[PDB]
Amino acid sequence: QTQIQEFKEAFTVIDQNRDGIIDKEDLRDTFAAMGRLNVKNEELDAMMKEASGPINFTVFLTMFGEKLKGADPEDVITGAFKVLDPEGKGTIKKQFLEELLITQCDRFSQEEIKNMWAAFSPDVGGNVDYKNICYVITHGDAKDQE
Amino acid sequence: IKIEFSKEQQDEFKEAFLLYDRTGDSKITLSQVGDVLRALGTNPTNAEVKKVLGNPSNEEMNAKKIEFEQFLPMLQAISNNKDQGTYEDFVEGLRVFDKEGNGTVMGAELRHVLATLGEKMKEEEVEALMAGQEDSNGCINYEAFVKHIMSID
Amino acid sequence: DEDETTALVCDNGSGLVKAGFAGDDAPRAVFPSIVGRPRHQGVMVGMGQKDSYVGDEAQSKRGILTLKYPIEHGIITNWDDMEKIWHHTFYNELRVAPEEHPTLLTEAPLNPKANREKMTQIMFETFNVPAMYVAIQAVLSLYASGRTTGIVLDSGDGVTHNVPIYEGYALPHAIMRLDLAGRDLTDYLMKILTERGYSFVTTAEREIVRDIKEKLCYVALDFENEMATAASSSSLEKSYELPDGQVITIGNERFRCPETLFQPSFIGMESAGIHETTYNSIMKCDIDIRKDLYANNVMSGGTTMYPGIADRMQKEITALAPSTMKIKIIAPPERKYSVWIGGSILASLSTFQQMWITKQEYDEAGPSIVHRKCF
Amino acid sequence: DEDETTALVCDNGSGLVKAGFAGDDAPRAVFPSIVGRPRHQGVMVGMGQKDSYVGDEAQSKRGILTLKYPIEHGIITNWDDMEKIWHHTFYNELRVAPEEHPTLLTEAPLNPKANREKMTQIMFETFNVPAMYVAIQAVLSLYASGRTTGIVLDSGDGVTHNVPIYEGYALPHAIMRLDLAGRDLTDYLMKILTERGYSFVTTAEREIVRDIKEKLCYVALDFENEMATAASSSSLEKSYELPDGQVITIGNERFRCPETLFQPSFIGMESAGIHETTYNSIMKCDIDIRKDLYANNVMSGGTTMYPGIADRMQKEITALAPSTMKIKIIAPPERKYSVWIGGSILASLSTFQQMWITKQEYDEAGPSIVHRKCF
Amino acid sequence: MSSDAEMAIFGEAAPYLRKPEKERIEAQNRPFDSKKACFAVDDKEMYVKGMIQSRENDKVTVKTLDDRTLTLNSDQVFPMNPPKFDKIEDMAMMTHLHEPAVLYNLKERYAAWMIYTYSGLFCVTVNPYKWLPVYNPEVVTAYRGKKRQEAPPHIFSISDNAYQFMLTDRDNQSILITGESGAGKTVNTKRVIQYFATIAVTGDKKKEQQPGKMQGTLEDQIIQANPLLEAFGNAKTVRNDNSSRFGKFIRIHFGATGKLASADIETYLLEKSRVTFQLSSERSYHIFYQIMSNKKPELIDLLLISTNPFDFPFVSQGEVTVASIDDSEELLATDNAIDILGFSSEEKVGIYKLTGAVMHYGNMKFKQKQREEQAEPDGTEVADKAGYLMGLNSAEMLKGLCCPRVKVGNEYVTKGQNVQQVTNSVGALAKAVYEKMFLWMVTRINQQLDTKQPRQYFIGVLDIAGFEIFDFNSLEQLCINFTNEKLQQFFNHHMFVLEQEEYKKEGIEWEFIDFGMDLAACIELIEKPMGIFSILEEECMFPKATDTSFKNKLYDQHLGKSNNFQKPKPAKGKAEAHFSLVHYAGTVDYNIAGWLDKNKDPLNETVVGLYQKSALKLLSFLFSNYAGAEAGDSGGSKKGGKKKGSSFQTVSAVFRENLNKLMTNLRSTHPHFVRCLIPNETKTPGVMDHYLVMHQLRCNGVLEGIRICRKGFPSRILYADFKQRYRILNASAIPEGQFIDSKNASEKLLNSIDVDREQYRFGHTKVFFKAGLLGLLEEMRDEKLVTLMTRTQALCRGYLMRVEFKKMMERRDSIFCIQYNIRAFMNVKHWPWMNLFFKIKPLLK
Ligand SMILES: Nc1ncnc2c1ncn2[C@@H]1O[C@H](COP(=O)(O)OP(=O)(O)O)[C@@H](O)[C@H]1O
Ligand SMILES: Nc1ncnc2c1ncn2[C@@H]1O[C@H](COP(=O)(O)OP(=O)(O)O)[C@@H](O)[C@H]1O
């Protein structure tokens, strides 16, 4: 029940509206603590409209649904990469990796690869370090690194 | 005549291969494409049978999976594939001590330098994935095994 | 290997074939034209004779053998017999291979087209000559001579012709025939000798008289006087040895025989004797040319070989012909082979060579090709 | 075992048989042709003689025997006697079992066809020869000689012929016959000697005188001169011993007896002497050939054996014949066996071998098969 | 170890015989496909191998190992033998006989230093010019006491096995030997002689022993003889500088059981015709020239002659001398030779003088200028000298010559004599004396040669020259061809018997006739009645007949009548010949100069009668043979000739005589045939002159050889054998095992092959193959062999790819995730909430 009950919490903190719906002021007011601003009209509401009425957490779940669609655990991913790397923890070779995405199977574009690079995709030694990329995105990112 | 299962089984092996090439289907892999699943027929069969003029490479053409479908069966359907028992007799001619040893190099060079070759790594690798050892190697054993296909059980 | 070959000139005579290679002065091979086998044919103990060679052999062979002449009167009556003679000339005498050489054969006056045609086929089919020609015997003779104008008296074996030529042209109408020649004389002589109480019926006996005619016979300055002289004549009696061993004397007969040419009445010919026919021929030609004819007339053939022939002939001719008119009588030294030579030339005519008849022509047209629009 | 066999050549002479094996230079067998029994036939104590063998036996036996010649004049009149003789030849003289050998028989000129046939039937049926031939005696002799050409004078026992031959061909018409020869001459010597007052009638005596004919006699250079010389003749008086022991003289007689050939009138034959018959024979042939015939005169037979015969032959012909003519008389040294040798050539003639008549031929066609198309 | 080879490859005895295992192994699988690779006719070389580009119609387009393109002819191309064949012992084995095939094999072996090959019965050995260890006594050890199959071709074999055979089989045996110079023909005779020596002693059986008197061993016994006899015989023909005039059967006989009893010599063949006459660059027997030279001069004087070969007509007919000779030295040698054989010089004086007598008879003229027909002697110079040497009366002799007198029941005078005849008696006289001398000599060697040791069964040896063809063939040639023919026919018949026996034994159906017979028509034409020979002879009889008459006779009988009888056309110039024949043999053309004239043998009786008296040797020779006696007219003979009607007998008759005799013996004994060769004109190893051998082969008849083999079903194998190799061509599931019964399976292969039955037949034991089936078979296996190779390679390829595969699939899922998740990322990073959530979480405690 993890994740959603997890979500359930996130939703309620902001709530305190009545009854449990997290409606516009909640959102804005959350920001203050948050403590970053917060376009207080408009934008916030537009956020609402992807959904059809007040939410209520359940629809909060349902709205999310795209998020569920692709994404495997965490784990399993590593996982897929691991298959790539004959060597150690070392890990995946840069030049291999570009080649394996880009010309290979479902092709990354010229730009598409580039975006990833530009974000940099922490890397050093002229290579790559995956775990820190996962730390940002899938783990969600909760840092990275100062 | 094949038959859903079947051609469809051929299809998804095919699917991945397309996926590799980027994502579309060469023509060329062809022989390999449904060598993988089982018919032996060799370059000259491949080349004429449809890859391109025997398909040195790209980008002369592209198959595609469905066309490739009927190929796999007909280009199959012969039969004379080849066969462990028959091979041995071939192997034996070299063997010359009838010992069912050879003579390991002789051996690799035979199939190499003979008939069509047959690259060095490929030869070297196969024999000792096949795992029969050097003094001297049952060319009959090696053939009998390798024919049988790599797994066995 | 320049290009060009010989020509086999075969001349088919009524009594003698003459043949050789063109470009030669005279026929290398001359042999009797006959066919003959043991008339009696005894048997014996064995064999090794040839059934009808005739050829040279016969003449030595006299007494055993028989004669036939396929070409008896100049036209070849018998083909089968004919084939063999050609075989003899090629193989036996000439020792040549017919395959290799173009061959020129000659034929008689008034030879039928069919006759040429039979000849032709035999040459090609039987013999395998590459090439073949058929030549007009008198014409060859004309060729040999070399004279454009004038008039010729050809008396050989068995016919005697007077033939005016003006600019190479034998005026056909002018031309005269006498059957008489010298086969007849041979025959005549047999008769005359017999009256004395000598006999020469036979074939062997035939040859003998011929020998006597050719060695002994002569033509008189004047027939009438000659008879007159004979009585007191003492030269006339010369003697001849027979093969038998016995000896004949030939007094008057010597001149008597040839007199016949001048006087055909001897044998029983109605014919005008030679001088008259000559004259008849010229008058038959246009008046103007006659001057030339008279000046040039010209003896040919074996039967014109008698010494005394020319001198008389002018004597006779002058008598017939007009006062002022000039007369010459010409005779070639080796007249008899005049026929062969003439052929020898025209077979041997390189410039003319296109004339020769080909196997292809024979195939395409037929043998007739040689006949029609050529020789 | 390769193949092929001999040939029994027995020449049936009017007085002597000569028989032999083919390929023999001359006969193994020669014995008389007579049949004869003891004339008186005394009886005796016992027997053990052979009645009419006549054999050789008769000769030594002289006085006792009768004689007969089945083949008296060359034609076998008596088959019964003849069978006796042939039996003798095979078994006794030759000792050869006939069935084994193909046998060639000679036969007289003008042997009747029937005569020839009777011979055959006997050989096959009587003797059982596998094969046989009959041949002609004159013909045989010519063969031995090997003269293609020339005229032959073949005087034998009792016939004499002149055969001009041209290329192996007896010319039938030329041929002259003579009754006269040895048998006759033998009598003549007999009679003449009796003239002296000697008496030689008997058979025994005839044998005797024959012996004197063959030892003593000769032919003269010139008859007339020799006779005249005879008066002074020291030489003639040669003597001869008789078996009785008495010695007789001869020598006028020596030449006279042979002179008969030249002048047959002596005995009373009208016939021309051989020299002139020779001339007549030649004249009968054609003139052209005759030259050869003069050139090659060959003598034949026993009665041409007299010495100096040729020289005389030479002179006589020269006398008759033409001035220029070349004349040569050739005589073979053992001329008499010319007939046998003769058969020997023909008999052992293996190319010709078919010529032998065979049993089947005898059966199918008959004996006449021998006659009719072969010998 | 495996390989078709035994004992020790390396050991030196082996190398002529063996081939080393390695050499064989490399040899057998050199490349080969029948289809292209072939032979083409080459004007110069003979044939050449080459390969085919292209075909259409009669013309074929081709490339050679001189690699130009000629377009030869369809027939004119020659299919080669399959690879399986190469390095092959017995050429007969070769499936494709063709001549360039023929070159290839023996050529290939010889360079190899392999001299010997086995052709059927035949054992051919080539001449290595170089020295080869083969001869070694170590090798001998390998041989002796072994069967011939057991080792590759060698003399010691033939010598041995035959030795055994004689004992077991208890029969004489024969070997023939051919070889021109550079055969090594002589050595082998040494080698064999010793061989006799080796076993002749050996025994296992006892044959009468003595301590012994001696006089030299056999072998030497023979050898001592040689030089002299070959001095006198031997000579230089226009072709052949030293070619023996005569034919030698050298007889070594043994006892039942293989003791050696001893030896004897018989001679046949003397063309006396040389004696008078010689043509061109040729000359008489060596001696004539020799005598005349100045080694000898005492002898020349006994002769009463001025030493100068020119001086006399008898000699003078041809050329005086030859290079490379020295008459004098050879004179010295020969006198020495005469000594060594060890007679007793009086006989020498003797043997000289009488040959000498010949010469004197050479002197005298013939004339009394033929009074009239007869010829009488002129000079009586020679007759007295003649008379003297013999010791006979010159009044008599002259007379005897002048006019011989002879016998019958009565004796006749052989008138007989002529001017023309007589001389053809003086020469004959000469020839006779010489030959009688030769013969008498020979018997003497036998007396000497007579050893101790008993004999039943002998082996050995015939020597006379091989078939010849000349620009100008003549009486000499035709006879030789005649002799060869029947011989060859003899051979054909012999094997014809055997094969059908074998066929019968196996029980495969035989329909054939004796192989010899096909020829028979030809020889018959020569031999039989109305034959060319017979016809010629009786033509001899007619005094009248001439070349032409003979000519017509043959023509009438044969011309066109037989295909055999044909005639040369005139060409330019080139040649003139009366007629040609087609012997088995190949064709031949002959011409006349001589023969009837050459023919005339006439005996002169009285001379023989006269001769009987006086000088001792002369009486003996003329009287008759050596001590012995004869018979007469009772019980003989066949139309043997005896007289021939008169004038004694001709040559042809006697020829019949001899040959029949020769045949009688040969067929008595079991033949073996050896042919020795010389490879090529310049003497080098390896080397093969294509033209020379080819000519050799037809003359050899070896090709013929091969032709008979065509006739039947050559290739034979066991079924079991057949199955083992061939099956790879047509496989089935069931294990080779001996699971597949040999009978069934081979049945199965054949029919499933769909060969027609005609080609082969079964067979309890064997399957009978025709030409060519194997050729098909071999070829197909060749093609088969390749394909599976490629197919294995196919297999190996699959191996690679298949193995790739799992790695590939594995990657696929790894990849798939990669692509989508990042893609998941591409949107997320933008979408506000996602970002916020990530920030919000860490807020949580
Ligand atoms: N010297 C000569 N004298 C007379 N007549 C001759 C002489 N020479 C040849 N003849 C004859 O000439 C005739 C052959 O002449 P030829 O011109 O050849 O005749 P054709 O051409 O008609 O056959 C024969 O009758 C022959 O006898
Ligand atoms: N030397 C001779 N001299 C004379 N007459 C001889 C001589 N020899 C044989 N004759 C005779 O020849 C005759 C036999 O000759 P031959 O030719 O055999 O005759 P035919 O053949 O007619 O029987 C007998 O009369 C015989 O006396």
mmCIF file of N, CA and C in Angstrom, chain C residues 59-110:
data_model
loop_
_atom_site.group_PDB
_atom_site.id
_atom_site.type_symbol
_atom_site.label_atom_id
_atom_site.label_comp_id
_atom_site.label_asym_id
_atom_site.label_seq_id
_atom_site.Cartn_x
_atom_site.Cartn_y
_atom_site.Cartn_z
ATOM 1 N N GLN C 59 49.097 -52.746 -130.852
ATOM 2 C CA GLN C 59 49.809 -52.695 -132.091
ATOM 3 C C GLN C 59 50.878 -53.746 -132.101
ATOM 4 N N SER C 60 51.613 -53.893 -130.981
ATOM 5 C CA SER C 60 52.558 -54.966 -130.846
ATOM 6 C C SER C 60 51.758 -56.224 -130.867
ATOM 7 N N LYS C 61 50.570 -56.133 -130.257
ATOM 8 C CA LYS C 61 49.689 -57.208 -129.938
ATOM 9 C C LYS C 61 49.098 -57.779 -131.192
ATOM 10 N N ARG C 62 49.339 -57.146 -132.368
ATOM 11 C CA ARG C 62 48.715 -57.524 -133.612
ATOM 12 C C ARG C 62 48.726 -59.012 -133.769
ATOM 13 N N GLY C 63 47.577 -59.547 -134.216
ATOM 14 C CA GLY C 63 47.441 -60.942 -134.506
ATOM 15 C C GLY C 63 46.581 -61.582 -133.464
ATOM 16 N N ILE C 64 46.765 -61.230 -132.176
ATOM 17 C CA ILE C 64 45.830 -61.731 -131.208
ATOM 18 C C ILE C 64 44.507 -61.018 -131.275
ATOM 19 N N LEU C 65 44.530 -59.675 -131.405
ATOM 20 C CA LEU C 65 43.491 -58.829 -130.863
ATOM 21 C C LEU C 65 42.453 -58.430 -131.875
ATOM 22 N N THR C 66 41.404 -57.727 -131.371
ATOM 23 C CA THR C 66 40.369 -57.111 -132.159
ATOM 24 C C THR C 66 40.417 -55.638 -131.909
ATOM 25 N N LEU C 67 39.836 -54.836 -132.829
ATOM 26 C CA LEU C 67 39.721 -53.424 -132.590
ATOM 27 C C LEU C 67 38.271 -53.068 -132.547
ATOM 28 N N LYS C 68 37.942 -52.052 -131.727
ATOM 29 C CA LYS C 68 36.754 -51.282 -131.931
ATOM 30 C C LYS C 68 37.202 -49.858 -131.851
ATOM 31 N N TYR C 69 36.515 -48.940 -132.555
ATOM 32 C CA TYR C 69 36.794 -47.558 -132.298
ATOM 33 C C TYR C 69 35.515 -46.958 -131.827
ATOM 34 N N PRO C 70 35.394 -46.617 -130.578
ATOM 35 C CA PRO C 70 34.235 -45.920 -130.126
ATOM 36 C C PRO C 70 34.132 -44.659 -130.909
ATOM 37 N N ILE C 71 35.199 -43.936 -131.102
ATOM 38 C CA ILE C 71 35.213 -42.604 -131.719
ATOM 39 C C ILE C 71 35.448 -42.775 -133.207
ATOM 40 N N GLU C 72 34.960 -43.873 -133.788
ATOM 41 C CA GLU C 72 35.299 -44.334 -135.127
ATOM 42 C C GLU C 72 35.348 -43.266 -136.191
ATOM 43 N N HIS C 73 34.261 -42.476 -136.241
ATOM 44 C CA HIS C 73 34.183 -41.393 -137.207
ATOM 45 C C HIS C 73 34.287 -40.021 -136.568
ATOM 46 N N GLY C 74 34.893 -39.894 -135.397
ATOM 47 C CA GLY C 74 35.136 -38.626 -134.742
ATOM 48 C C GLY C 74 34.130 -38.303 -133.629
ATOM 49 N N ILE C 75 32.935 -38.871 -133.651
ATOM 50 C CA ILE C 75 31.946 -38.632 -132.614
ATOM 51 C C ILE C 75 31.990 -39.837 -131.660
ATOM 52 N N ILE C 76 31.879 -39.631 -130.299
ATOM 53 C CA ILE C 76 32.021 -40.759 -129.429
ATOM 54 C C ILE C 76 30.697 -41.456 -129.304
ATOM 55 N N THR C 77 30.580 -42.611 -129.994
ATOM 56 C CA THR C 77 29.421 -43.461 -129.975
ATOM 57 C C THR C 77 29.310 -44.252 -128.697
ATOM 58 N N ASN C 78 30.442 -44.725 -128.121
ATOM 59 C CA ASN C 78 30.308 -45.638 -127.013
ATOM 60 C C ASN C 78 30.888 -45.020 -125.776
ATOM 61 N N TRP C 79 30.020 -44.736 -124.785
ATOM 62 C CA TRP C 79 30.409 -44.122 -123.548
ATOM 63 C C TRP C 79 31.203 -45.052 -122.684
ATOM 64 N N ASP C 80 30.728 -46.302 -122.499
ATOM 65 C CA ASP C 80 31.367 -47.162 -121.544
ATOM 66 C C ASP C 80 32.768 -47.358 -122.002
ATOM 67 N N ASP C 81 32.923 -47.651 -123.302
ATOM 68 C CA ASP C 81 34.222 -47.859 -123.855
ATOM 69 C C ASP C 81 34.952 -46.568 -123.710
ATOM 70 N N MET C 82 34.218 -45.452 -123.854
ATOM 71 C CA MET C 82 34.838 -44.164 -123.819
ATOM 72 C C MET C 82 35.438 -43.933 -122.470
ATOM 73 N N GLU C 83 34.746 -44.349 -121.390
ATOM 74 C CA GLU C 83 35.194 -43.986 -120.077
ATOM 75 C C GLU C 83 36.565 -44.544 -119.888
ATOM 76 N N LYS C 84 36.767 -45.793 -120.337
ATOM 77 C CA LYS C 84 37.980 -46.499 -120.061
ATOM 78 C C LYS C 84 39.137 -45.810 -120.715
ATOM 79 N N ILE C 85 38.947 -45.271 -121.933
ATOM 80 C CA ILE C 85 40.051 -44.662 -122.621
ATOM 81 C C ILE C 85 40.526 -43.496 -121.814
ATOM 82 N N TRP C 86 39.584 -42.701 -121.276
ATOM 83 C CA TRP C 86 39.963 -41.543 -120.524
ATOM 84 C C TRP C 86 40.721 -41.998 -119.323
ATOM 85 N N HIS C 87 40.308 -43.133 -118.736
ATOM 86 C CA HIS C 87 40.993 -43.650 -117.590
ATOM 87 C C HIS C 87 42.409 -43.920 -117.990
ATOM 88 N N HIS C 88 42.601 -44.526 -119.177
ATOM 89 C CA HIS C 88 43.904 -44.950 -119.601
ATOM 90 C C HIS C 88 44.785 -43.746 -119.720
ATOM 91 N N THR C 89 44.284 -42.676 -120.365
ATOM 92 C CA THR C 89 45.133 -41.546 -120.586
ATOM 93 C C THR C 89 45.530 -40.998 -119.256
ATOM 94 N N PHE C 90 44.539 -40.770 -118.371
ATOM 95 C CA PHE C 90 44.865 -40.114 -117.142
ATOM 96 C C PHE C 90 45.844 -40.969 -116.407
ATOM 97 N N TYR C 91 45.385 -42.174 -116.017
ATOM 98 C CA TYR C 91 46.137 -42.967 -115.097
ATOM 99 C C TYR C 91 47.327 -43.598 -115.743
ATOM 100 N N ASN C 92 47.096 -44.323 -116.852
ATOM 101 C CA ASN C 92 48.151 -45.155 -117.341
ATOM 102 C C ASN C 92 49.228 -44.341 -117.994
ATOM 103 N N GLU C 93 48.861 -43.556 -119.032
ATOM 104 C CA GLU C 93 49.854 -42.850 -119.792
ATOM 105 C C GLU C 93 50.378 -41.640 -119.070
ATOM 106 N N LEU C 94 49.467 -40.708 -118.724
ATOM 107 C CA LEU C 94 49.840 -39.430 -118.183
ATOM 108 C C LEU C 94 50.270 -39.563 -116.758
ATOM 109 N N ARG C 95 49.672 -40.527 -116.030
ATOM 110 C CA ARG C 95 49.984 -40.727 -114.643
ATOM 111 C C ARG C 95 49.817 -39.441 -113.916
ATOM 112 N N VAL C 96 48.556 -38.980 -113.888
ATOM 113 C CA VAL C 96 48.180 -37.738 -113.296
ATOM 114 C C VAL C 96 46.956 -38.031 -112.490
ATOM 115 N N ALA C 97 46.571 -37.127 -111.570
ATOM 116 C CA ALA C 97 45.332 -37.356 -110.891
ATOM 117 C C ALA C 97 44.366 -36.330 -111.385
ATOM 118 N N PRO C 98 43.246 -36.787 -111.866
ATOM 119 C CA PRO C 98 42.336 -35.950 -112.590
ATOM 120 C C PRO C 98 41.827 -34.900 -111.669
ATOM 121 N N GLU C 99 41.896 -35.170 -110.356
ATOM 122 C CA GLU C 99 41.291 -34.322 -109.378
ATOM 123 C C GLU C 99 41.956 -32.989 -109.472
ATOM 124 N N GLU C 100 43.288 -33.022 -109.620
ATOM 125 C CA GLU C 100 44.118 -31.866 -109.495
ATOM 126 C C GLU C 100 43.982 -30.909 -110.654
ATOM 127 N N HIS C 101 43.706 -31.388 -111.890
ATOM 128 C CA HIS C 101 43.847 -30.499 -113.019
ATOM 129 C C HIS C 101 42.528 -30.256 -113.686
ATOM 130 N N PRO C 102 42.328 -29.038 -114.130
ATOM 131 C CA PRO C 102 41.341 -28.718 -115.121
ATOM 132 C C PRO C 102 41.687 -29.432 -116.392
ATOM 133 N N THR C 103 40.663 -29.892 -117.142
ATOM 134 C CA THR C 103 40.906 -30.699 -118.301
ATOM 135 C C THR C 103 40.148 -30.103 -119.458
ATOM 136 N N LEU C 104 40.798 -30.075 -120.645
ATOM 137 C CA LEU C 104 40.213 -29.587 -121.863
ATOM 138 C C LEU C 104 40.101 -30.770 -122.788
ATOM 139 N N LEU C 105 38.857 -31.084 -123.213
ATOM 140 C CA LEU C 105 38.632 -32.129 -124.174
ATOM 141 C C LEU C 105 38.175 -31.451 -125.421
ATOM 142 N N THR C 106 38.398 -32.073 -126.603
ATOM 143 C CA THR C 106 37.968 -31.440 -127.817
ATOM 144 C C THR C 106 36.994 -32.362 -128.475
ATOM 145 N N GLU C 107 36.134 -31.812 -129.357
ATOM 146 C CA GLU C 107 35.140 -32.648 -129.967
ATOM 147 C C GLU C 107 35.049 -32.333 -131.428
ATOM 148 N N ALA C 108 34.364 -33.238 -132.154
ATOM 149 C CA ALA C 108 34.274 -33.242 -133.582
ATOM 150 C C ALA C 108 33.254 -32.253 -134.037
ATOM 151 N N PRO C 109 33.396 -31.929 -135.288
ATOM 152 C CA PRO C 109 32.439 -31.147 -136.012
ATOM 153 C C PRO C 109 31.127 -31.869 -135.986
ATOM 154 N N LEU C 110 30.019 -31.118 -135.817
ATOM 155 C CA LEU C 110 28.687 -31.655 -135.769
ATOM 156 C C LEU C 110 28.551 -32.657 -134.664
#
